[PDB]
């Protein structure tokens, strides 16, 4: 999960065709690879306000807790039983 | 030896296993002996049970087994190659079992299991060609004073000498059953020499017995 | 008491060990068996597990936990699952056969200690986790079992006291590691003999999910003889933290390879020279003892000499006291033959489910047979020592600490014989 770590700014991806020649990924876009990290969303939405870039914000995505417990792959009534391990 | 199948005409889905009705009794007296919800556990003797009757266990024993269980297939294909005593490919009716573990090999097994061999004329993991004899070498049967001793089929044979096995399989050859026992002079597992304890009569009920009892 | 050893036929749990009394109950009950049964079972739980704590008996598995500890791990309120005591009969221990002579001459000894044990715990049943390998055992104890029954000792009213209790008999089916308590408890509950991960302790999530104890057959068929003799004479015996009488299977290079019942802390030369008639060859033909089955360190000669075989002298010899199976190894030995053989049937048993035992076992098997050749050089000596050392500890139960163990004792006393090996290698075939 370390790659899950900071925000991230990425741009809509635009046009790739083949070159005619030898048959490359040929591209028209400047921030076509371009990829900014920030700490923070408020940083990253306030350096796309600031150089007048329209974003759109997905909200960080966190794993909720699980309840883990090894006992109850083998219990009495469950059908959290395991048939085999 | 492997532990993946493949179907071979004698070993397939479609090879004809099924319990005979006494068997069925005995299986009803298995499945009662666990609780109401636990069948599964009665996959390990059923299907040694699969063993008794047949002799080996073709891939219908066990999916019989799964089947009257009501469990999964797999959960039986997995116990029957994780527990060595489930042949899952035919055995001779003797199935000779050498133990060679080091309180056997310290008392001289290899001599044995040489004997078996240029008895028999086959070596470890062969079948003899009537099909009467098995021969393989086990871990700790847990026969260890008696060492050095052999397993066939239900019974040990031990304190054993290349002399006494070479007899052993002279009259199993000749169809006579022989008894489970030290071939040398002694009955269980008393020392050779006679008893260095237990010479004394056992003393009954009330002896030694605490006050408030 | 200072010395130990010289144990009397009196004072003797295990009577008819060699087979020469009737095992069937009329032979049993005119030896002291199911005699005041009733009177033990209803004095309570409490009474049971006092009498099993003052006794200091400790775990005859190998592992030596005290039993009046491990079995009042029960003593708890019914949480609606039933309970259930579970008798370990697998004895997979190389060098051990004594839970073998114990269910085929004394069976219904071990029937009133699951009876009284399962009192103690508030167990419902009884699931004997027999060997496989041993059938004509099983069925002997089958007829003990229904010989209780039949004299209303078990079942219905057990001996008269309003008590409810079975006995069942679970054959295995070729697994050591099915000794192991949660792989024998996996093994009952028909799946593969894997061991379960601890916490949850088996009192807590047992069999079938039960509050459950597994114990071997020695300290269950003990503890009517404790309940009747009382707690205070079975810790008459042996030193301190070391109580009683221990089944002894002296094997291998001995005179006379033989099963004795002998006083706990009694010196191993003493037992070897006393009731084996000694080392084949002399006392000074011995080269190594194992003193304990398979899975503990051996010792040499030097040792062999001064120790004492209970618990607490054979840690203090960096060993363990184990099964008290004494495998004796005389000087014509090719003693890394057989702790090569060793490794190599704690490689075939070994059920291959956490990392370090199902690969380091094996490769310590590959290790070992170049040892035995002497195909290696002397850095890889000390390399399987960390081989070991990360395999000890690592594991999900203890059989790779088991195979561990014999490869640590095996270079920490023979390390020059190693050597030599590999160096007449290196010079005869270069
Ligand atoms: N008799 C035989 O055939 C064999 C015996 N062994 C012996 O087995 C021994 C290893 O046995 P293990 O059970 O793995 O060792 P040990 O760490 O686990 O535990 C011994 C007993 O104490 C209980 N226990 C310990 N701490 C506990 C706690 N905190 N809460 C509840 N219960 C607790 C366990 O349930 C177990 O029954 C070896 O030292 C070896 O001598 C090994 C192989 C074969
Ligand atoms: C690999 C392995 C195998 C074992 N096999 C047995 C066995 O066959 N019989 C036995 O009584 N204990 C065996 N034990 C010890 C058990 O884990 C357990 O401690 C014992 O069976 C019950 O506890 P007790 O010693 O108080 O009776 C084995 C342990 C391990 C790690
Ligand atoms: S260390 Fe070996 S014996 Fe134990 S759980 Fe793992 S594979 Fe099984
Ligand atoms: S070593 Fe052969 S029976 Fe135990």
Not at chain 3, 70 to 95: C, H, I, Q, T
Not at chain 3, 262 to 288: C, F, Q, R, Y
Not at chain 3, 393 to 411: E, R, S
Request: aromatic content about 8%; charged content about 25%.
């Amino acid at each position: 999960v370390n790659n899950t770590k900071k925000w991230k700014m990425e741009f809509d991806t635009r046009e790739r065709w083949e070159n005619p020649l030898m048959g490359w990924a040929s591209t028209a876009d400047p921030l076509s690879n371009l990829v900014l990290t920030f700490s923070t969303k408020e940083d990253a939405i306030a350096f796309a306000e600031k150089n007048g870039w329209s974003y759109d914000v997905e909200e960080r995505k966190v794993p909720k807790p699980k309840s883990k417990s090894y006992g109850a792959n083998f219990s009495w009534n469950k059908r959290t039983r395991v048939s085999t391990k | 030896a492997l532990f993946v199948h493949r179907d071979t005409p004698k070993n397939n889905p479609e090879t004809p296993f099924d319990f005979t009705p006494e068997n069925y009794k005995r299986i009803e007296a298995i499945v009662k002996n666990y609780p109401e919800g636990h069948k599964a556990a009665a996959v390990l003797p059923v299907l040694d049970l699969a063993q008794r009757q047949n002799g080996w266990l073709p891939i219908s024993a066990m999916n019989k087994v799964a089947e009257i269980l009501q469990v999964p297939p797999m959960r039986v294909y997995e116990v029957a190659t994780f527990y060595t005593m489930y042949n899952r490919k035919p055995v001779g009716k003797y199935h000779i079992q050498v133990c060679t573990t080091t309180p056997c090999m310290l008392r001289n097994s290899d001599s044995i299991l040489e004997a078996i061999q240029k008895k028999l004329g086959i070596k470890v993991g062969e079948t003899t060609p009537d099909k009467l004899f098995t021969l393989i070498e086990v871990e700790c049967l847990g026969a260890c004073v008696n060492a050095p001793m052999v397993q066939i089929n239900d019974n040990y044979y031990e304190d054993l000498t290349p002399k006494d096995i070479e007899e052993i399989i002279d009259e199993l050859k000749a169809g006579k059953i022989p008894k489970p026992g030290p071939r040398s002079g002694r009955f269980s597992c008393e020392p050779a020499g006679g008893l260095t304890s237990l010479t004394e009569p056992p003393k009954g009920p009330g002896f030694g017995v605490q006050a408030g009892l | 008491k200072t010395s130990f050893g010289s144990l009397k036929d009196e004072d003797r749990i295990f009577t008819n060990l060699y087979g020469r009394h009737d095992w069937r109950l009329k032979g049993a009950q005119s030896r002291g068996d199911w005699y005041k049964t009733k009177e033990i079972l209803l004095k309570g739980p409490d009474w049971i597990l006092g009498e099993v704590k003052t006794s200091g008996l400790r775990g005859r598995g190998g592992a030596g936990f005290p039993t009046g500890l491990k079995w009042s791990f029960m003593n708890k309120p019914s949480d609606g699952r039933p309970k259930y005591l579970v008798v370990n009969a697998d004895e997979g221990e190389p060098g051990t056969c004594k839970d073998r002579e114990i269910i085929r001459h004394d069976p219904h000894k071990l029937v009133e200690g699951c009876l009284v044990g399962g009192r103690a715990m508030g167990a419902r049943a009884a699931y004997i986790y027999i060997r496989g390998e041993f059938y004509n055992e099983a069925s002997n104890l089958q007829v003990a079992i229904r010989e209780a029954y039949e004299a209303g000792l078990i079942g219905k009213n057990a001996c008269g006291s309003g008590y409810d209790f079975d006995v069942f008999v679970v054959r295995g089916a070729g697994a050591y590691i099915c000794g192991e308590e949660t792989a024998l408890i996996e093994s009952i509950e028909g799946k593969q003999g894997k061991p379960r991960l601890k916490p949850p302790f088996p009192a807590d999530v047992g069999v079938f999910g039960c509050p459950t104890t597994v114990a071997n057959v020695e300290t269950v068929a003990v503890s009517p003889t404790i309940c009747r003799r009382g707690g205070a004479w079975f810790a008459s015996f042996g030193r301190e933290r070391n109580s009683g009488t221990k089944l002894f299977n002296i094997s291998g290079h001995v005179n006379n390879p033989c099963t004795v019942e002998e006083e706990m802390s009694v010196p191993l030369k003493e037992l070897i020279e006393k009731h084996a008639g000694g080392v084949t060859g002399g006392w000074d033909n011995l080269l190594a003892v194992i003193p304990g089955g398979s899975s503990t360190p051996l010792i040499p000669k030097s040792v062999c000499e001064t120790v004492l075989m209970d618990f607490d002298a054979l840690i203090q010899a960096q060993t363990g006291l184990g099964t008290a199976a004494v495998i004796v190894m005389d000087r014509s030995t090719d003693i890394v033959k057989a702790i090569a053989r060793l490794i190599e049937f704690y490689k075939h048993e070994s059920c291959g489910q956490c990392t370090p035992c199902r690969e380091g076992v094996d490769w310590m098997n590959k290790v070992m047979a170049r040892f035995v050749r002497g195909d290696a050089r002397p850095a890889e000596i000390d390399s399987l020592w960390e081989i070991s050392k990360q395999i000890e500890g690592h594991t999900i139960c203890a059989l790779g600490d088991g195979a561990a163990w014999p490869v640590q004792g095996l270079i920490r006393h023979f390390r020059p014989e190693l050597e030599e090996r590999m160096q007449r290698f290196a010079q005869q075939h270069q």
